[PDB]
Amino acid sequence: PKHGKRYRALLEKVDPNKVYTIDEAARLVKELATAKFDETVEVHAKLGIDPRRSDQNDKTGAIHAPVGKASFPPEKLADNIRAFIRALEAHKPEGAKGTFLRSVYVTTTMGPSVRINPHS
Amino acid sequence: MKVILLEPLENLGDVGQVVDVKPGYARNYLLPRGLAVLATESNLKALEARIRAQAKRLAERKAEAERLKEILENLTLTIPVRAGETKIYGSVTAKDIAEALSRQHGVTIDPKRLALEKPIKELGEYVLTYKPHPEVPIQLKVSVV
Amino acid sequence: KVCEISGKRPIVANSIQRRGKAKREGGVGKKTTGISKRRQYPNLQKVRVRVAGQEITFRVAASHIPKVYELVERAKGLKLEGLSPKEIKKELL
RNA sequence: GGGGCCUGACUGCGAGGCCUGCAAGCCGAGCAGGGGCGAAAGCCGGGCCUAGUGAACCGGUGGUCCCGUGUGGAAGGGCCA
RNA sequence: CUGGUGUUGGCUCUUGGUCGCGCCUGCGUAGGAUAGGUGGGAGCCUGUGAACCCCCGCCUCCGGGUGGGGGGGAGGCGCCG
RNA sequence: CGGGGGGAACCUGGGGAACUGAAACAUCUCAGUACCCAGAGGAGAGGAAAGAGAAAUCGACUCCCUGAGUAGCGGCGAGCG
RNA sequence: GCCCGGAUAGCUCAGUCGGUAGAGCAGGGGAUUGAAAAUCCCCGUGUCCUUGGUUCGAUUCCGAGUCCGGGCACCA
Ligand SMILES: [Mg+2]
Numbered sequence A: 001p002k003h004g005k006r007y008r009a010l011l012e013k014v015d016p017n018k019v020y021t022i023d024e025a026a027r028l029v030k031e032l033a034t035a036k037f038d039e040t041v042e043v044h045a046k047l048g049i050d051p052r053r054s055d056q057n058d059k060t061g062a063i064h065a066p067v068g069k070a071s072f073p074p075e076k077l078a079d080n081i082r083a084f085i086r087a088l089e090a091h092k093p094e095g096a097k098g099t100f101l102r103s104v105y106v107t108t109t110m111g112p113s114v115r116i117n118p119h120s
Numbered sequence B: 001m002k003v004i005l006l007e008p009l010e011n012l013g014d015v016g017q018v019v020d021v022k023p024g025y026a027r028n029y030l031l032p033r034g035l036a037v038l039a040t041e042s043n044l045k046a047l048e049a050r051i052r053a054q055a056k057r058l059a060e061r062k063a064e065a066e067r068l069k070e071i072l073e074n075l076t077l078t079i080p081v082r083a084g085e086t087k088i089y090g091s092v093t094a095k096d097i098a099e100a101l102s103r104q105h106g107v108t109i110d111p112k113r114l115a116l117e118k119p120i121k122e123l124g125e126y127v128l129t130y131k132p133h134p135e136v137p138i139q140l141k142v143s144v145v
Numbered sequence C: 001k002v003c004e005i006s007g008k009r010p011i012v013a014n015s016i017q018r019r020g021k022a023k024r025e026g027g028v029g030k031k032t033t034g035i036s037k038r039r040q041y042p043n044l045q046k047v048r049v050r051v052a053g054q055e056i057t058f059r060v061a062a063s064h065i066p067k068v069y070e071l072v073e074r075a076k077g078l079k080l081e082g083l084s085p086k087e088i089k090k091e092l093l
Numbered sequence D: 001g002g003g004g005c006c007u008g009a010c011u012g013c014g015a016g017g018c019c020u021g022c023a024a025g026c027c028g029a030g031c032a033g034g035g036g037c038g039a040a041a042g043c044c045g046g047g048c049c050u051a052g053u054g055a056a057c058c059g060g061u062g063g064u065c066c067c068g069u070g071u072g073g074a075a076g077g078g079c080c081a
Numbered sequence E: 001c002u003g004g005u006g007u008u009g010g011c012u013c014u015u016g017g018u019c020g021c022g023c024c025u026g027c028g029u030a031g032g033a034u035a036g037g038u039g040g041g042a043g044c045c046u047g048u049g050a051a052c053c054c055c056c057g058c059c060u061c062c063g064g065g066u067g068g069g070g071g072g073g074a075g076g077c078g079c080c081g
Numbered sequence F: 001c002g003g004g005g006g007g008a009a010c011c012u013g014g015g016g017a018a019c020u021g022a023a024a025c026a027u028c029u030c031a032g033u034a035c036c037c038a039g040a041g042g043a044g045a046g047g048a049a050a051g052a053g054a055a056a057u058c059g060a061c062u063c064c065c066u067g068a069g070u071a072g073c074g075g076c077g078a079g080c081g
Numbered sequence G: 001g002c003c004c005g006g007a008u009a010g011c012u013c014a015g016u017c018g019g020u021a022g023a024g025c026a027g028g029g030g031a032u033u034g035a036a037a038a039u040c041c042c043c044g045u046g047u048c049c050u051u052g053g054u055u056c057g058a059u060u061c062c063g064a065g066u067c068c069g070g071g072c073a074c075c076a
């Protein structure tokens, strides 16, 4: 159709409009990675910074990079997630005005994305 | 600017129902012609009552019925009718029924509230509901002699 | 005039004309070129409403209009007739 | 007039005078700090000198041992530039 | 004179702004081809019914992209290069 | 049952100047004064804290003495307080 | 003092919707009328003020500095 069902089934345990924690979703991410291989859970968050800002991530203000497999224990995802948050909060440009980290999603290699508050 | 209706108006209706109109609509059209009343907390409680008096008090003419079925229901009538086998020499109206039912036992029934159409007359055997809404099918036997 | 319920009536006010960037920012300060006396009327209107065998009109302030109705209601429970539309009014508190 | 280094077109003061109704204007040796040129003696607190200027008030900025309306902090002031 | 409001209400037609979301969008040399950036990236995709053909709306760099639909039948497709 | 009209000042409320001062003048001052109107009474007003303001404080209101020409307000002027 | 807009041929004016910088008119020639052109043809010349950094560098995109263009105010 638009997507394959292998994905259509994961849309059953991910409220379309709800913020999850790094413990409420870190374990719900290890269950939405239904592939025949060990995937890589990654996190995507939009940064409130200026793109073309030479002295201040692609060229639109998006962050990527993977951090964990699709099996890693609850203490390897819930713990390695915060290890990426502070990896950013340690490089926030001087004039980076605006919520430095507005949106934040946590999606794997083939599974959907779960909006989560990197502060709980 | 809340208001309590009357005639079920489109987009907002079913009397008693409360709705948020614009002051103008209410003051200049609704109340003038009497399509509703101001949602004053003086009729907002006055409707609280209008709503209980029927709701609770209703448990009787549609709730006490249970007392009216337990006594009957598992009961059996059987009434003396002048007949001739499979054909009575007259008939028994619902009115004919309770007529003696209020002497054979002491049970009160409203004929106009029974359920058979034509006046018995025939025979074989009878058994039919009383009324109304959550009803109770009674059991009556057409006798002999 | 005056409000037949709120009691509100016209009052005196000054029309102060000022010029100059405030001190609240910019500089030097505001300046009064001139002051004048002027009135401030009540936004009163009129509200006609049946109430028994008459219509009776109410010249009342804007932010009070509603009370007028909460009065044709409290009225209900009381007997008022005879050629007394002025009195009807009279009676309603 | 020409050239080599330089920034004293210093900060904190200022004995003692000139001028003078007031308040302004003017000259200033010398001490302290930290400097520049000189081998040193020394000179340097702009310009051979006398014009190129504007009290207060109200505000604008940059600082800052200060005040900050019950207390903390702010708001808003003061002081210095 | 005038904008916003109060007095000031029904019913429609028509458009602007904004955030939600759902969708496609993108066509310069090279190249299967109409490639938006960056990451994940060997598994996906089809009786949760794909390969092929006709119909059919929209877009047009007239090249395709792509959706509704009927049809159909066990195969599409990516890496490597 | 009452009211209405009057009363030298005094009193509360609703309205409310200009001269003058600022050695001109508009903010400011005179001044909520003069005056007009309504009302009250031998007084009138006010009155038992949604107060004051820095004190483990006080405790209706009104009047006098201080506080005090203080705190402040002010074309930071005249002046007000 | 703040918010805005910008020179590129002699003047005037557009810009991968980042790489391919091009018009009117002026000027040269030829075409040119009785007369000068209105008609007719074909081209010259460069960071697109320009500091940059993103990108493959940039004319175009961001730090953005200089000048000019229009705006809204203030003046103790
Ligand atoms: Mg983008």
Ligand SMILES: [Mg+2]
Pocket: C001, C002, C041
């Ligand atoms: Mg009036």
Ligand SMILES: [Mg+2]
Pocket: C014, C015, C016
């Ligand atoms: Mg005004």
Ligand SMILES: [Mg+2]
Pocket: C063
């Ligand atoms: Mg209102």
Ligand SMILES: [Mg+2]
Pocket: none
């Ligand atoms: Mg002197």
Ligand SMILES: [Mg+2]
Pocket: D042, D043
């Ligand atoms: Mg010397």
Ligand SMILES: [Mg+2]
Pocket: none
């Ligand atoms: Mg000296």
Ligand SMILES: [Mg+2]
Pocket: D047
């Ligand atoms: Mg000189």
Ligand SMILES: [Mg+2]
Pocket: D047
């Ligand atoms: Mg010299």
Ligand SMILES: [Mg+2]
Pocket: D057, F075, F077
């Ligand atoms: Mg002055």
Ligand SMILES: [Mg+2]
Pocket: none
């Ligand atoms: Mg304090």
Ligand SMILES: [Mg+2]
Pocket: F001
């Ligand atoms: Mg009497």
Ligand SMILES: [Mg+2]
Pocket: none
């Ligand atoms: Mg009397």
Ligand SMILES: [Mg+2]
Pocket: none
């Ligand atoms: Mg005067």
Ligand SMILES: [Mg+2]
Pocket: F022
């Ligand atoms: Mg004078």
Ligand SMILES: [Mg+2]
Pocket: none
């Ligand atoms: Mg008075």
Ligand SMILES: [Mg+2]
Pocket: none
């Ligand atoms: Mg006193």
